[PDB]
């Protein structure tokens, strides 16, 4: 049962596309090899979300999972998006703060586990088992946020004020936003359906656009990205 | 309806396998840590194509997608191949020219979008929607080729003549070849069926073998790969 | 027909989880940026296996493939695990020995081919074709082991005794273990069913736990991981 949410899908598609476009049109002249990296990553993010929102607006990113007492529409494309998208975001933060490869690898891996585990949960037929997965995925996330908030902040304090500041903002943004997803999941049509898929998609759209475009804007608009 | 094309699949399998074998038997003695990288990448390419051509010759890489007024055989394995294969190729070019990580990341990402988007298009049931995807994927490609042709060429001009020259050839080859794929797609059984899957596969075989083995030969046969 | 093996799945889940937990609780204080990398990789490994063993214990990682004269339960999750897990393991060995990027790339690629090819074999409907894939995958493996045993050993001889020693042990362990998998596959319910899926899973559990936790223990317990 997925059609009334089309409005947010289409609006999500537009925002992602324009957000991409805008970022593209801004990274052209950039010559700094460091600023360059930030534009690539930050541009790639909305670009991926674009293709996936579009896949949902066209019905491809929509699937049917049997559980509870019916056939439930699971928008799988979200994970296909988040799988490459979340780690890309983390990467931005990693470069910005100049984290160790080991911590970068540890996060990228914790992130893939988080989205991968989330996809399993979203497709699992045993209604009760869907929450075990949600539980594993959320632990994965709290680990990621734990590092971002405590480990990275410490690494940022050693950079110049501009970088420290932009990181702080960015950090606060992603942490507050990333944790909303599990709560949305838990109350949406994929978990304990308290909110209809209609509103679910809306919350996810606002969140997504904020976690990427909004995120990107904040970052790409700082001198923090330069050496 | 996929069986008369078996001949090109089998021939594609043989060429990929021997192409791999030959490359393997050539990288053995190589000690230069730089030449080493080029052999790995360039060897891995046909090796992947091998497994995928074989998957098509055995019926595994073949699927059925409903669209238009019938059930259409979509060789999905092509994308499974191209997904790892195209970026690997790009990587070769990146090392050769010594491109910035940011541009390397930007291309790898543009490439994954291109093949990923292509796979969606190839599996999309709404006949008309298949061209939207083709349209997104082709834009992705033109971006990649734009950088290769203009950005990379500039980066190569700063290398020694041997490297500049080999890049030029390589560049001209991949650009001319990579753009044939969308045209083939557009006229083949996955788009506006003007050419039968039978000939489609043939064009794809010639193209593939050229874009990899041919490509590999040109490169591995130059001193351009050495420091 | 997959239920009597539940016992090994559940025990596999517990061991992977605790193995992860234990490793996590050990990498906390570690400050050395090199030791850090080893903890990330080595911790991520069992963590992945955890999620996949769990997926099998809950029925999600189980699928049905038609071949021979019946419907056969294929535990696909094993490959989803091994796909990220085997290369991670290799990576540990690569860092430990400080191998060239080209050889690291060549192995990672040979490994993905090995698991990818194995997954195809495990899902291939033409009973006879399943062994062609097994044959390709095993060649892939023998290449990996060839390098580990001969190429890496040579690279390790140039490190300090502690590192050389830990590598030797590790090397001997992975080589002896990794080769058991194809033999198990060949005699298990996925190949020439001589052993029942029940015992198959047991052998795979012992193997897995050994190839990761056991492996991890040996490594993380040496000073070899420090600069
Ligand atoms: C280069 C890297 C190193 C990249 C790696 C990429 C790869 C590994 C990503 C995997 C991502 C995962 C997370 C997504 C998988 C989720 C999975 C559960 C969902 C799978 O389904 C979708 C998949 C297959 O589609 C299908 O084709 C099969 C073969 O033909 C069919 O057998 C399936 O049935 C079919 O599924 C579809 O159709 C169903 C329709 O049913 C119909 O419903 C209507 C309703 O009105 C009606 O009832 C009809 O009667 C009924 O028949 C539908 O329900 C299903 O949902 C489905 O549509 O699709 C392939 C997706 C593709 C892989 C997405 C890619 C995403 C983007 C483009 C990625 C960009 C990534 C780059 C790589 C990032 C760069 C980063 C750098 C830093 C490295
Ligand atoms: C290590 C990395 C970091 C690696 C990441 C690897 C991963 C993410 C790659 C994903 C690649 C994507 C792009 C491919 C997905 C395309 C997707 C749409 C197609 C999916 O279908 C194929 C998939 C599943 O097969 C199936 O198993 C299910 C479970 O059992 C079944 O439910 C499905 O139905 C089944 O699909 C098959 O069977 C269908 C049969 O129907 C029958 O048709 C006959 C016709 O005569 C008759 O009518 C019968 O009656 C009828 O029943 C068939 O139609 C379907 O097409 C299908 O065969 O398969 C898994 C593929 C595997 C993942 C391919 C791997 C590719 C190679 C080996 C990769 C090498 C990569 C390394 C990693 C590169 C190294 C690079 C370094 C630089 C990093
Ligand atoms: C970030 C990177 C760069 C990461 C890339 C990740 C990605 C590419 C990995 C792909 C891995 C591949 C190897 C696994 C694919 C194997 C494939 C053949 C199996 C596919 O099936 C599973 C898949 C889809 O599930 C399904 O959803 C569809 C859509 O809704 C349905 O149409 C399918 O039918 C459904 O399949 C399920 O249900 C079947 C049920 O049938 C029922 O059986 C019961 C029996 O009692 C009864 O008869 C019922 O009546 C009947 O209906 C069942 O049989 C099927 O098996 C299946 O359950 O699932 C998605 C899996 C997800 C992708 C796994 C992720 C793994 C973990 C979490 C990865 C952690 C990775 C990080 C990235 C590593 C970090 C490393 C760093 C160094 C980079
Ligand atoms: C799992 C395993 C380790 C547990 C052993 C359970 C044992 C009593 C067996 C009974 O469990 C039987 C199975 C169904 O299988 P069936 O064949 O249909 O019967 O129930 C389904 C199994 C259970 C309901 C699920 C158990 C899940 C674990 C408790 C998961 C841990 C994940 C948390 C998010 C992590 C917290 C970390 C903390 C340390 C900070
Ligand atoms: C039974 C279990 C398998 C189930 C658990 C659920 C699990 C599937 C999801 C969690 C994801 C997890 C597996 C990801 C792997 C992370 C691993 C690679 C990290 C290796 O560690 C690398 C260091 C980098 O060091 P730094 O630069 O000084 O910072 O991590 C950062 C160092 C930090 C400064 C210190 C961090 C300390 C930890 C937060 C505490 C250890 C965790 C606890 C024992 C319990 C788990 C909590 C849960 C929220 C992760
Ligand atoms: C998408 C969105 C941005 C467009 C809003 C469309 C709006 C009028 C809604 C009607 O669109 C309704 C949907 C079907 O959904 P349904 O629920 O079945 O009804 O049609 C299907 C939707 C449309 C037919 C597809 C629109 C696609 C966009 C125009 C795609 C852009 C991709 C190009 C390749 C990029 C060119 C780049 C340039 C800037 C250089
Ligand atoms: C609505 C949209 C979402 C739909 C578009 C379709 C889209 C899905 C497919 C395109 C793929 C694209 C998303 C890939 C992301 C690329 C991005 C990461 C690049 C960031 O940029 C990194 C720099 C590296 O700099 P260098 O070393 O000096 O060279 O790129 C190279 C710098 C170059 C020297 C300058 C390049 C300039 C551009 C070619 C012009 C900008 C593009 C245009 C506004 C329109 C799009 C054209 C289409 C062909 C890409
Ligand atoms: C028809 C074929 C397509 C079918 C074959 C099955 C195939 C699909 C599976 C094999 C996986 C293979 C494709 C993986 C690609 C590897 C490739 C990228 C390697 C490039 O090479 C990089 C170097 C790194 O050099 P170093 O640091 O001095 O060590 O490899 C290491 C250098 C070593 C020191 C020297 C190694 C020599 C080789 C072992 C001998 C060459 C192989 C033989 C001709 C036959 C194949 C044997 C099979 C067991 C691989
Ligand atoms: C652009 C998208 C962003 C920043 C997405 C972030 C997504 C998450 C933090 C998702 C988390 C989830 C859980 C913690 C558990 C349940 C399922 C998920 C995948 C929704
Ligand atoms: C070895 C294989 C090579 C070099 C493959 C290259 C493939 C492409 C450039 C494919 C491009 C496509 C489009 C631009 C749109 C439609 C679908 C594709 C995936 C065929
Ligand atoms: C933690 C898991 C480990 C170390 C797994 C190793 C797995 C292999 C070496 C698997 C090899 C296989 C073949 C060589 C051919 C047949 C199928 C496989 C995938 C089981």
Ligand 8 centroid – CA B67 distance (Å): 42
- Contact yes or no for C122/C76 (Cβ under 8 A): yes
As a whole number of angstroms, the distance between CA C20 and CA C28 comes to 13
Residue B92: in which H helix or E strand, if any?
helix B77-97
Structure tokens at C120: 């195809």
Experimental method: X-ray
Find the helix or strand (DSSP H, E) in which C63 lies: strand C62-67
Give the list of residues 6+ apart from residue C85 with CB closer than 8 angstroms, or none: C45, C48, C49, C212
* CATH, range A1-227: 1.20.1070.10
Buried b (16+ CB within 10 A) or exposed e, A23-41: beeebeebeeeebbbbbbb
Tell me phi and psi for residue A64, to 5 degrees: -120, 125
Q: How far is CA B211 from CA B10, B45, B82, B205, C216, in A?
A: 18, 10, 11, 10, 41
How far is residue B136's CA from residue B167's CA, in Å, rounded to a whole number?
28
B29, B221 Cβ separation under 8 angstroms: no
Q: Is A47 close to B109, i.e. CB distance below 8 A?
A: yes
Cα C106 versus chain centre, distance: 17
CA distance B113 to B79: 11
Those residues whose C-beta lies under 8 Å from the C-beta of residue A206, and which sit 6 or more positions away, are none
Q: Output the furthest CA–CA distance in chain B (Å, rounded).
A: 57
**Residue of C31, C47, C212 to mutate for A, most A C-beta atoms under 10 A:** C47
Assigned token pair, B178: 């990579």
Mapped onto helix, strand or coil, the DSSP state of residue B63 is strand
* Angle subtended at Cα B106 by Cα B104 and Cα B110, rounded to the nearest 5 degrees: 115
CB C164 within 8 A of CB C106: no
Residue with tokens 């559940």: C10
What residue owns the CA closest to ligand 8's atom 48?
A: C139
Measured in whole angstroms, the distance separating CA C90 from the mean position of its chain's CA atoms is 9
Rounded CA-CA distance A93/A91 in Å is 5
**Token pair recorded at residue A82:** 């988040």
Tokens of B9: 């699949």
Instruction: Among B20, B81, B82, say which to mutate for ligand 10: greatest number of ligand atoms within 8 Å of CB.
Output: B82
Sequence-separated contacts (24+) of C138-143 with Cβ below 8 Å: C138/C182, C140/C110, C140/C111, C140/C113, C140/C114, C141/C114, C141/C178, C141/C179, C141/C181, C141/C182, C143/C110
Both structure tokens of A125? 């037929």
CB A32 within 8 A of CB A226: yes
In chain B, the N- to C-terminal Cα span, in Å, equals: 50
Question: Quick check: A20 and B84 in contact, CB under 8 A?
Answer: no
Q: What is chain A's alpha carbon radius of gyration, rounded to the nearest angstrom?
A: 18
How many helices (H) and strands (E) would you count in chain C?
10, 2
Q: Are A178 and A143 in contact (CB under 8 A)?
A: no
Strands C70-75 and C62-67: antiparallel
Helix, strand, or coil (residue C222): coil
Name all chains with 3 or more CB-CB pairs below 8 Å to chain B: A, C
SS3 B62: strand
CA B88 / ligand 1 centre spacing (Å): 22
Q: What is the DSSP letter of C158?
A: T
Distances (CA, A) of A208 to A8, A46, B163: 11, 9, 44
Listed in sequence order, the residues at least 6 apart from C143 whose beta carbon sits closer than 8 Å to its beta carbon are C110
Is there a contact between A134 and A191 (Cβ–Cβ < 8 Å)?
yes
For residues A63 and A71, give the distance between their C-alpha atoms in angstroms, rounded to a whole number. Answer: 10
Cβ–Cβ below 8 Å for A60 and B124: yes
Q: What count of CB pairs under 8 Å joins A to C? A: 50
Structure tokens at B72: 């259409």
Three state DSSP letters for A87-123:
HHHHHHHHHHHCCCHHHHHHHHHHHHHHHHHHHHHHH
Q: Which residue has the tokens 């063993």?
A: C53
- Ligand 9 atom at shortest distance from the alpha carbon of A179: 9
Q: What is the DSSP letter of B194?
A: S
The distance of Cα C97 from the centroid of its chain, to the nearest Å, equals 19
Residue C62 tokens read as 């189980």
Of A100, A113, A132, the CB nearest to C33: A100
| Cβ proximity of A166 and A218 under 8 Å | yes
Instruction: Return d(Cα C219, Cα B223) in angstroms, integer.
Output: 40
Q: Report which of A129, A151, A131 is spatially closest to residue A139, judged by C-alpha positions.
A: A131
A153-156 CB contacts, 8 Å cutoff, 24+ apart: A155/A97, A155/A98, A155/A99, A156/A96, A156/A97
The protein residue with its alpha carbon nearest to ligand 5, atom 26, reads: A103
Closest C-alpha to B127, from B69, B184, B56, B171: B69
- Cα–Cα distance measured from residue C190 to residue C73, given in angstroms and rounded to the nearest whole number: 8
Instruction: Locate the chain C residue with the closest alpha carbon to B34.
Output: C102
Which ligand has the nearest atom to the CA of A67? 3
Q: Which residue, C155, C156, C154, C147, is CA-closest to C178?
A: C147
Question: If DSSP codes are grouped into helix, strand and coil, which group holds residue C65?
Answer: strand
What is the C-alpha separation between C121 and C196, in angstroms, rounded?
A: 18
Report the chain B residue with the minimal C-alpha distance to residue A54. Answer: B133
Of B181, B159, B176, B177, residue with least CA distance to B225:
B159
User: Strands, DSSP E only, in C68-110?
Assistant: 70-75
Q: Which residues of A touch C51 (CB under 8 A)?
A: 113, 116-117, 120, 136
Cβ distance of A126 and C41 shorter than 8 Å: no
Ligand 2 center to B55 CA (angstroms): 9
Beta bridge partners of A70: A67
B164: helix, coil or strand? helix
Q: Return d(Cα A72, Cα B156) in angstroms, integer.
A: 54
Q: What's the CA gap between B198 and B196, in Å, rounded? A: 5
Phi-psi category of A59—alpha, beta or left, where left has phi over 0 and alpha has psi -120 to 50? left
Helix/strand/coil (H/E/C) assignment for every residue in chain A:
CCCCCHHHHHHHHHHHHHHHHHHHHHHCCCCCHHHHHHHHHHHHHHHHHHHHHHHHHCCCCEEEEEECCEEEEEECHHHHHHHHHHHHHHHHHHHHHCCCHHHHHHHHHHHHHHHHHHHHHHHCCCHHHHHHHHHHHHHHHHHHHHHHHHHHHHHHCCCCHHHHHHHHHHHHHHHHHHCHHHHHHHHCCCCCCCCCHHHHHHHHHHHHHHHHHHHHHHHHCCHHHCC
For B9, B14, C48, the CA distances from C132, given in Å and listed in that order, are 16, 14, 28
Alpha-carbon dihedral B7, B9, B15, B17, rounded to 10 degrees: -130
Q: For A226, left (φ over 0), alpha (ψ -120 to 50), or beta?
A: beta
């Amino acid at each position: 049962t997925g059609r009334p949410e089309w409005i947010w899908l289409a609006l999500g598609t537009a925002l992602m596309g324009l957000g991409t476009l805008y970022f593209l049109v801004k990274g052209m002249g950039v010559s700094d090899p460091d600023a360059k990296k930030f534009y690539a990553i930050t541009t790639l993010v909305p670009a991926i979300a674009f293709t996936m929102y579009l896949s949902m607006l066209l019905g491809y990113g929509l699937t049917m999972v049997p559980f509870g007492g019916e056939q439930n529409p699971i928008y799988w494309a979200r994970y296909a998006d988040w799988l490459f998208t979340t780690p890309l975001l983390l990467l931005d933060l990693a470069l910005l703060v100049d984290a160790d490869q080991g911590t970068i690898l540890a996060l990228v891996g914790a992130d893939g586990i988080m989205i991968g585990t989330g996809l399993v949960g979203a497709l699992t037929k045993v209604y009760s088992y869907r929450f075990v997965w949600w539980a594993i995925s959320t632990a994965a996330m709290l680990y990621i946020l734990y590092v971002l908030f405590f480990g990275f902040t410490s690494k940022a304090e050693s950079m110049r004020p501009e970088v420290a500041s932009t990181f702080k903002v960015l950090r606060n943004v992603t942490v507050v936003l990333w944790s909303a997803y599990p709560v949305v999941w838990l109350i949406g049509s994929e978990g304990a359906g308290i909110v209809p898929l209609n509103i679910e998609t809306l919350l996810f759209m606002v969140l997504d656009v904020s976690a990427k475009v909004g995120f990107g804007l904040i970052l790409l608009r700082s001198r923090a990205i330069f050496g």
